[PDB]
Amino acid sequence: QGLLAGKRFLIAGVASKLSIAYGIAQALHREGAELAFTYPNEKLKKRVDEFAEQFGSKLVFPCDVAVDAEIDNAFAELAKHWDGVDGVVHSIGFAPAHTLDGDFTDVTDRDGFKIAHDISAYSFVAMARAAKPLLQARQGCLLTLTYQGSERVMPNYNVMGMAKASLEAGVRYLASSLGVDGIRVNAISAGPIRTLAASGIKSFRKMLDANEKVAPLKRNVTIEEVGNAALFLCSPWASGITGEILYVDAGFNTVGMSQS
Amino acid sequence: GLLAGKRFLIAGVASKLSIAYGIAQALHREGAELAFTYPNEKLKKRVDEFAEQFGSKLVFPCDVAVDAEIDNAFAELAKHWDGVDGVVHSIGFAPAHTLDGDFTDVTDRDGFKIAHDISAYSFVAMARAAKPLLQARQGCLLTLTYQGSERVMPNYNVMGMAKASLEAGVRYLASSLGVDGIRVNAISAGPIRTLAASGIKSFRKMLDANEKVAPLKRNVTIEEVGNAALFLCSPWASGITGEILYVDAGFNTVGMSQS
Amino acid sequence: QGLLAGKRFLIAGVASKLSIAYGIAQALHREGAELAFTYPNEKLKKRVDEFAEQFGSKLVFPCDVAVDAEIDNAFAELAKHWDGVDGVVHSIGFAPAHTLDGDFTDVTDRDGFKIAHDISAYSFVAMARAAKPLLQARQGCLLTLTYQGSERVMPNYNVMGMAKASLEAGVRYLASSLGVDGIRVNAISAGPIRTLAASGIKSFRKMLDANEKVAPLKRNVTIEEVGNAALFLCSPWASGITGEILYVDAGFNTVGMSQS
Amino acid sequence: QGLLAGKRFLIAGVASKLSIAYGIAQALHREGAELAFTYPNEKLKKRVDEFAEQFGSKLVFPCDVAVDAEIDNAFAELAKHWDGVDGVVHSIGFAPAHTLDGDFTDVTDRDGFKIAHDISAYSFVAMARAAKPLLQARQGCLLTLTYQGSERVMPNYNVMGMAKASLEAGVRYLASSLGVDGIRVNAISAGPIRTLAASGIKSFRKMLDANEKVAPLKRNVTIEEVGNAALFLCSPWASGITGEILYVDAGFNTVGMSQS
Numbered sequence A, C, D: 001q002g003l004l005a006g007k008r009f010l011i012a013g014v015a016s017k018l019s020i021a022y023g024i025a026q027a028l029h030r031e032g033a034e035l036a037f038t039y040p041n042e043k044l045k046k047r048v049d050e051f052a053e054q055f056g057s058k059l060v061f062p063c064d065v066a067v068d069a070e071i072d073n074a075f076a077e078l079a080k081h082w083d084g085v086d087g088v089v090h091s092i093g094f095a096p097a098h099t100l101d102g103d104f105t106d107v108t109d110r111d112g113f114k115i116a117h118d119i120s121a122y123s124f125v126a127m128a129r130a131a132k133p134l135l136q137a138r139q140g141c142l143l144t145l146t147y148q149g150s151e152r153v154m155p156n157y158n159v160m161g162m163a164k165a166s167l168e169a170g171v172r173y174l175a176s177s178l179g180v181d182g183i184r185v186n187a188i189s190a191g192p193i194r195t196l197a198a199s200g201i202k203s204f205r206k207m208l209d210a211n212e213k214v215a216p217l218k219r220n221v222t223i224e225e226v227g228n229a230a231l232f233l234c235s236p237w238a239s240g241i242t243g244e245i246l247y248v249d250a251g252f253n254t255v256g257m258s259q260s
Numbered sequence B: 001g002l003l004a005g006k007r008f009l010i011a012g013v014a015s016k017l018s019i020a021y022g023i024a025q026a027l028h029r030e031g032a033e034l035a036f037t038y039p040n041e042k043l044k045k046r047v048d049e050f051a052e053q054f055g056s057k058l059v060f061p062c063d064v065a066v067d068a069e070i071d072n073a074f075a076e077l078a079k080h081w082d083g084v085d086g087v088v089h090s091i092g093f094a095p096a097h098t099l100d101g102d103f104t105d106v107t108d109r110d111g112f113k114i115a116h117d118i119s120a121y122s123f124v125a126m127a128r129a130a131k132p133l134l135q136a137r138q139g140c141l142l143t144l145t146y147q148g149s150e151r152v153m154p155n156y157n158v159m160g161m162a163k164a165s166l167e168a169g170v171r172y173l174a175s176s177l178g179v180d181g182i183r184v185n186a187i188s189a190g191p192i193r194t195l196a197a198s199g200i201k202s203f204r205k206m207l208d209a210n211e212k213v214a215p216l217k218r219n220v221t222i223e224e225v226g227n228a229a230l231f232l233c234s235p236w237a238s239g240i241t242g243e244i245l246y247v248d249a250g251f252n253t254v255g256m257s258q259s
């Protein structure tokens, strides 16, 4: 009998034991929640399917957020088994590698722009809609993952910064849209973490080593600390919070100027 | 005047109520002279004349949905002008239906794509196609956003996300082009009745609320925005880049007004 | 055996069963923490004495934050039973009634400014210092209560906005100063709540009813929801968060304007 | 016949030819503005008298902002010379050297806090009040100088950050208070610069070189750019802007951090 006794949650974005979604799932399950998972993509099906099976779950559905049908079908299918859900976790972001390697101006093409904002920003709004029925029944909450590159320039984050900034604006509009129906909408601004979202990024732990020295706590966060924070936001303890962007970066965002 | 001999491109003049027209008017007031784009044949006719009331020809096709039209637009302008001291981006668009109803219900994928494409990417594309022409004279870039990116306004919906993406662009552009001495800034203008108000049922009632909340108890004008944009396109703004300047009579500063 | 098993916390600012500190204390106790209490003077003595005896505590010490000595003595006294401490909760704010009733320019005198910033802003920094040793022992955390009047203009809040804005800057400098020692520093920006901090403020109901109409969730927060959030920030689940201003206002802060 | 033909302005805070106020004064005068100046005490009299007459002005009044009387008297004096005023420039900040040299927690005493917030934050609100009548005559504007240490932690800036955070909140409440009367209130957040406010700061030069490396423009601002920008804010071109914090830092504030 944990904090999430009898509560259910959908987790989109588990790619490996390292994804931010995994640390979330572990924290939720650790507290008694029942879990469901999506995969983009059946390259990933087998790994996700009973990757679910550490979590007492078999509920594994295909969901590529580029296709409108895949979204609603995944929620109609997931509708078949579950009344509703007390939360939907959005841990999805993507942009064409080339748009994240070089000068922002030179490498940001129109297509690379479309995919970035499409996969990483609109997806959250689409899922929210297809999930609204399941969420009103249970007056669950929504949660997405953002990054403070939306508010500040980081080298090579480029169009992803614009996408995250759009995402963050969405959370606020979703919170007013769904707030009347008792559905809370929030996001976590996590510090940089070495996950599969770092593959192909040459600067990465040079970024990791910089964050380690600048963050007031002198360390980089983990998927556990992110999971624990996401757990709180998906819980009745966070019942008074909506449209909030919680920074889980060891306070990195608060430093103007460190001892070089 | 202050802008003696400097040149500026003005994209987004649709009518005499333009955010861009009032700015363009302010730019000319100080002696700079001007070039203009139009989205299609429609607006070709109206822009041609708006150019000639400011002593200008420089009137080129630019639908920001087409990549070619953009680069051609900066290629045409190369023939006439050595360089450019600034580019003014006053363009935004969404299916409108995405701006009428509940945010969740009415925000489809296409309406999202169009919103961010026309309203957010365009500035970055123009910035690129304009980079060479802008390096010649160490010009600057300027766009108009809306504080719906930070705060929820009813029926602004997907435009809020786009403007938020836009504002992030300004910062990355300013960091990218800053080494080139090219400044990148934006103006967050208060709401004002322009052709960007057609089809919005709540508008003036939005206008009447802003009139009561703004510390100054009034709504800004296209002139006041023009004057501010004039500064940002001027050497007086040489120390400012990646800045979002709020021209809303301070509305952005109130948490809540007397009922 | 709850989440705060064996953890102790100092609660500053319990004036009544409605105090924000009270909702905090209850949530901390709800999870098994041991509690300590301060009171500003005798008139306030009995209330903390019995408010402590409701959380299994008698540790009740006088602390008026206007006097330097009272602060350090309270922590020298509070030392007397406890080896160390896992957290200090700071829920204190005050300004001369007159300073908060009328035009900001006309009514903001120098002293009223002085008392405002002294009692409501510096106090947190002073307590933090006198609490540093006891906080290093257990690598505890610090928490204070703020209000979004620092960022945004509310009528009749006046100098309290400036003070809370100074407070919020303190959290960031404390978090950077004390973050090196593994001690986290964060604050909660709570929505308006009718407590004894509403006495003498006539606009409250139009305040409460307005926030109720604007907040995405269509309602005003409670000391329970604030307590629960503070509980999280004072817990290892918030180990990855420092220098954060957490908004507990039902998302009110995210609305630019609602159908007024 | 410049932009400020026939316009009048009060300038508080000219300490030397390096003062931020000095480059401001130069910019306003360059455009035809009427100028006035204050000095904190006798020692500085000779130099302020001399700077005024380099701008064709003698309007130089004693004003130490620690004393209430000196403020109103200084504005009582200038009531005598000028019908009204089109703007008041506030370029004053100060804190006890010791509070700006060392760990924030260790060196921030209550007094150093009191003086810091008193001289640097309340002064603007007091001046604003004493200036209201003359400012209503011509509905001029108010302007102060802030620093982004209010949002972000700068080493050794300490209590000055909290004061500037209070200052910035003041601008918003002043703008809301005085906006109805047509008086605009704004502030400039200037990049760091070697002025008389750099004496006694050992890290300054390393700070100057860091901003030069991080700022998108790869350089530090000058009093030219600060003077010119405030000139706008004191001008009818800025008639649609109030309660605004304009950053003149070569974009430094927008970087999360550049190439190492």
Ligand SMILES: NC(=O)c1ccc[n+]([C@@H]2O[C@H](COP(=O)([O-])OP(=O)(O)OC[C@H]3O[C@@H](n4cnc5c(N)ncnc54)[C@H](O)[C@@H]3O)[C@@H](O)[C@H]2O)c1
Pocket (backbone or CB within 6 Å): A012, A013, A014, A015, A016, A018, A019, A020, A021, A022, A039, A040, A063, A064, A065, A066, A091, A092, A093, A094, A119, A145, A146, A147, A148, A189, A190, A191, A192, A193, A194, A195, A196, A197
């Ligand atoms: N790792 C960090 O430092 C960091 C910081 C801030 C924000 N974030 C965000 O956290 C989120 C989760 O990342 P993570 O590190 O836990 O692991 P991750 O690498 O697995 O995140 C990417 C996930 O998005 C899914 N996805 C991508 N394209 C999809 C599509 N077209 N259809 C369906 N699904 C698709 C993938 O399944 C993938 O699991 C990311 O979106 C990231 O933007 C990460």
Ligand SMILES: NC(=O)c1ccc[n+]([C@@H]2O[C@H](COP(=O)([O-])OP(=O)(O)OC[C@H]3O[C@@H](n4cnc5c(N)ncnc54)[C@H](O)[C@@H]3O)[C@@H](O)[C@H]2O)c1
Pocket (backbone or CB within 6 Å): B012, B013, B014, B015, B017, B018, B019, B020, B021, B038, B039, B062, B063, B064, B065, B090, B091, B092, B093, B118, B144, B145, B146, B147, B188, B189, B190, B191, B192, B193, B194, B195, B196, B197
């Ligand atoms: N009016 C306000 O209250 C307000 C508030 C905040 C921001 N803004 C911004 O101000 C900007 C300028 O607005 P305005 O009021 O001066 O007049 P406007 O109505 O003409 O602005 C819209 C312009 O975008 C151009 N445009 C649209 N789609 C295009 C396309 N596919 N290709 C090329 N051009 C296209 C149009 O020519 C149009 O002139 C807006 O984009 C908006 O983001 C306005």
Ligand SMILES: NC(=O)c1ccc[n+]([C@@H]2O[C@H](COP(=O)([O-])OP(=O)(O)OC[C@H]3O[C@@H](n4cnc5c(N)ncnc54)[C@H](O)[C@@H]3O)[C@@H](O)[C@H]2O)c1
Pocket (backbone or CB within 6 Å): C013, C014, C015, C016, C018, C019, C020, C021, C022, C039, C040, C063, C064, C065, C066, C091, C092, C093, C094, C119, C145, C146, C147, C148, C189, C190, C191, C192, C193, C194, C195, C196, C197, C198
């Ligand atoms: N209630 C709200 O809507 C709201 C909103 C935002 C922030 N806050 C903050 O919450 C905090 C706590 O308020 P609460 O509602 O839980 O109960 P409360 O009314 O009791 O808060 C005031 C407390 O400050 C203490 N205090 C005042 N002067 C003191 C002094 N000189 N020395 C020592 N102690 C002194 C008092 O003991 C009192 O308990 C406030 O300080 C406020 O800044 C409240």
Ligand SMILES: NC(=O)c1ccc[n+]([C@@H]2O[C@H](COP(=O)([O-])OP(=O)(O)OC[C@H]3O[C@@H](n4cnc5c(N)ncnc54)[C@H](O)[C@@H]3O)[C@@H](O)[C@H]2O)c1
Pocket (backbone or CB within 6 Å): D012, D013, D014, D015, D016, D018, D019, D020, D021, D039, D040, D063, D064, D065, D066, D090, D091, D092, D093, D094, D119, D120, D145, D146, D147, D148, D189, D190, D191, D192, D193, D194, D195, D196, D197
């Ligand atoms: N120099 C920077 O990098 C920088 C950056 C951001 C903000 N600022 C702010 O600009 C303002 C002025 O800084 P500066 O660069 O011109 O240095 P400065 O020393 O040349 O000017 C500051 C002036 O405040 C005056 N002053 C101090 N106490 C006073 C009192 N009690 N009464 C009357 N006058 C008093 C001083 O005489 C001084 O001339 C300050 O508020 C500062 O915090 C400076």
Ligand SMILES: Cc1c(CN(C)C(=O)/C=C/c2cnc3c(c2)CC[C@H](N)C(=O)N3)oc2ccccc12
Pocket (backbone or CB within 6 Å): A093, A094, A095, A096, A097, A100, A146, A147, A155, A156, A157, A160, A192, A193, A196, A197, A198, A199, A200, A201, A204, A207
């Ligand atoms: C920190 C940091 C983040 C945080 N983060 C994970 C995000 O928010 C987003 C990631 C992201 C998006 N799209 C990607 C990839 C990663 C690469 C894998 C995938 N193979 C791909 O094709 N495209 O992204 C960065 C980008 C550059 C530099 C630093 C960072």
Ligand SMILES: Cc1c(CN(C)C(=O)/C=C/c2cnc3c(c2)CC[C@H](N)C(=O)N3)oc2ccccc12
Pocket (backbone or CB within 6 Å): B092, B093, B094, B095, B096, B099, B146, B154, B155, B156, B159, B191, B192, B195, B196, B197, B198, B199, B200, B202, B203, B206
């Ligand atoms: C205020 C306010 C704004 C501010 N504003 C001017 C904007 O930034 C955006 C304008 C906007 C976007 N899309 C539009 C049109 C205008 C109509 C012409 C175009 N032909 C169209 O089809 N679609 O937008 C709003 C949207 C809904 C409710 C209120 C507002």
Ligand SMILES: Cc1c(CN(C)C(=O)/C=C/c2cnc3c(c2)CC[C@H](N)C(=O)N3)oc2ccccc12
Pocket (backbone or CB within 6 Å): C093, C094, C095, C096, C097, C100, C147, C154, C155, C156, C157, C160, C192, C193, C196, C197, C198, C199, C200, C201, C207
């Ligand atoms: C909202 C809002 C708050 C929220 N809140 C509790 C605070 O943050 C601060 C409270 C506060 C500060 N000082 C007070 C009192 C209360 C009254 C008790 C005591 N009688 C007194 O002398 N002085 O306070 C306001 C004050 C004025 C206008 C609006 C608000």
Ligand SMILES: Cc1c(CN(C)C(=O)/C=C/c2cnc3c(c2)CC[C@H](N)C(=O)N3)oc2ccccc12
Pocket (backbone or CB within 6 Å): D093, D094, D095, D096, D097, D100, D147, D155, D156, D157, D160, D192, D193, D196, D197, D198, D199, D200, D201, D203, D204, D207
């Ligand atoms: C950069 C930077 C700033 C920005 N700056 C100019 C300010 O806003 C503040 C100046 C400042 C405050 N207090 C001072 C003095 C100057 C010295 C003369 C005065 N006589 C004094 O006794 N005390 O302040 C810093 C403080 C520490 C480290 C770096 C910085």
